[PDB]
């Protein structure tokens, strides 16, 4: 339908004095298209782009902002520079809505240098603390890549986790744990306490139940001793739910040739 080479020259035209928000938006779309189907990439081309993209920033226009994020987001493992961005970044951060902020972290995370990190940590603290989960959620994912990169220092942060540990959004409830597990999973022990930690606890954005299941079993699995008092507690609960899947989840695992307790399983089953 359409072709890259011409476009590659032409994109900079938005960068040419040209005012017509639409035009450029479209052109950007195409680039992304070229890209989406599959595209070579490289530096020179990038660098030239680096000056090109950069001037264009008296835009207020929110949507305009969106577009940017995406593009930048494109550059990550093959990323080029950050300092410019800092100011920019800062701008999202101070930036009123919430929104702006999430995209930026998101590009950042495969790509970056230890160093700055410290600074940006503070920002993290803030994200960590904010009530509109979303951004906070946005924050989290980045970290993972940062874990890719590393994430250990991220570890240091466990504390924040705790302050966070109080949660009330379901999905969100879910997200926290995922991290956590990773964290403690390098560690049996705590977890044992964790269990306890949840033990007082039920779960908000369920999903949480489920990872935990795999988990809850996963210690037990090796013979994290007592199925009996703990496991079972879990099970009645598990059993009970209309989170039929959860019930299942337990059910599926317990595949026991003699029937560990053959009986009950059959009800669950009937139900199945």
């Amino acid at each position: 339908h359409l072709e890259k080479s011409a476009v590659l020259q032409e994109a900079r035209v938005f960068n040419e004095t040209p005012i017509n928000p639409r035009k450029c938006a479209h052109i950007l779309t195409k680039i992304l298209y070229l890209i989406n189907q599959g595209e070579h990439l490289g530096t020179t081309e990038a660098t030239e782009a680096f000056f090109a993209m950069t001037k264009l920033f008296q835009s207020n226009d929110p949507t305009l902002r969106r577009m940017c994020y995406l593009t930048i987001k494109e550059m990550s493992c093959i990323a080029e520079d950050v300092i410019i961005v800092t100011s920019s970044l800062t701008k999202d951060m101070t930036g009123k809505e919430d929104n702006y902020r999430g995209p930026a972290v998101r590009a950042l995370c495969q790509i970056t240098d230890s160093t700055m990190l410290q600074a940006v940590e503070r920002y993290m603290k803030q994200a960590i603390v904010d009530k509109v989960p979303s951004v906070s959620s946005s924050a989290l994912v980045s970290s993972l890549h940062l874990l890719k990169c590393s994430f250990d220092v991220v570890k240091r942060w466990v504390n924040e986790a705790q302050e966070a540990a109080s949660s009330d959004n379901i999905m969100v409830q879910y997200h926290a744990l995922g991290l956590l597990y990773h964290v403690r999973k390098n560690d049996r022990l705590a977890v044992s306490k964790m269990i306890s930690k949840f033990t007082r606890h039920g779960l908000k954005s369920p999903f949480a139940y489920c990872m935990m299941i795999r988990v809850a079993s996963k210690q037990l699995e090796e013979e994290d001793g007592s199925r009996d008092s703990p496991l079972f507690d879990f099970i009645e609960s598990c059993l009970r739910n209309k989170h039929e899947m959860v019930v299942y989840e337990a059910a599926s695992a317990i595949v026991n040739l003699p029937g560990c307790s053959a009986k009950e399983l059959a009800p669950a089953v009937s139900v199945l």
Binding site: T29, Y33, N36, R66, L70, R106, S137, V141, M171
Partner: peptide, 21 residues
């Protein structure tokens, strides 16, 4: 509208996991 896809694409899942919903 081509844009909407792209836009869409990024929001829920971002490379792999589902952030948004």
């Amino acid at each position: 509208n081509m844009e909407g896809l792209f836009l869409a694409v990024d929001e829920i899942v971002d490379g792999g996991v589902i952030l948004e919903s």
